User: Which sequence fits this backbone?
């Protein structure tokens, strides 16, 4: 079947606050890379599609590798800087701007925990 | 999008032979891709059968009829959700086209035991093998 699964996550910062979504646990916005896309263009499309939010992808924060026997799965987190000033919540997906100490009291998705851990350090 | 994917696989049968594919070329002259059943991802707004039919048509130019579900393989990885659906399929069209670096063989279940199968496809092979052999 699938040779690889690449997932991208956007860590969007304004001030001391990070865009955290609850779509249930909390997560960073992002999604899967389509075949033929780079990781950055996958992330910019994914954020536009789900949130109408125009961002610039910056430096890569971390790569989460896995050793699962059946599928090769890799997650790529990028520090992102917003260009637009508009984001849309297509219904019942709530989003908050939170500081790191607000983020630590929260139920985060398992895939996103390394990013939350890193944002602190 | 959600961190969850649905995969479909076609078990194409002709007589007592099944279509087994090898999709790619490695860098090394002493390594090669393992075998697998043709298929791919289910895109949003598609049923499992229509995603399969589309995927077979796009990779192989092969008109197929999707029949009964043979098995479902679920994975419960902490970081990502994957479901595989294998369906028994019957050819309508009489020609398929293999692109660059793609090989395919029509094999019995006994001959299928000779090959190296992708780890994800191994439950499917075992199911096919348990029912005749």
Assistant:
């Amino acid at each position: 079947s699938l040779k690889s699964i690449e997932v991208v996550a956007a860590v969007i910062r304004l001030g001391e606050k990070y865009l955290c979504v609850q779509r249930f646990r909390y997560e960073f916005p992002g999604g899967k890379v389509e075949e033929g896309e780079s990781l950055q263009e996958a992330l910019q499309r994914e954020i536009m599609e789900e949130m109408d939010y125009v961002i610039e992808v910056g430096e890569k924060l971390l790569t989460v590798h896995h050793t699962y026997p059946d599928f090769e799965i890799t997650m790529h987190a990028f520090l992102c800087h917003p260009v637009g000033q508009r984001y849309v919540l297509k219904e019942h997906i709530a989003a908050q701007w939170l500081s790191t100490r607000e983020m630590a009291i929260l139920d985060w998705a398992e895939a996103d925990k390394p990013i939350v851990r890193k944002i602190s350090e």
Observations:
- Chain A has one domain: 1-121.
- Chain A touches chain B at residues 1-3, 5, 7, 23, 31-32, 46, 49-50, 64, 66, 68-71, 73, 75, 109-111 (CB under 8 Å).
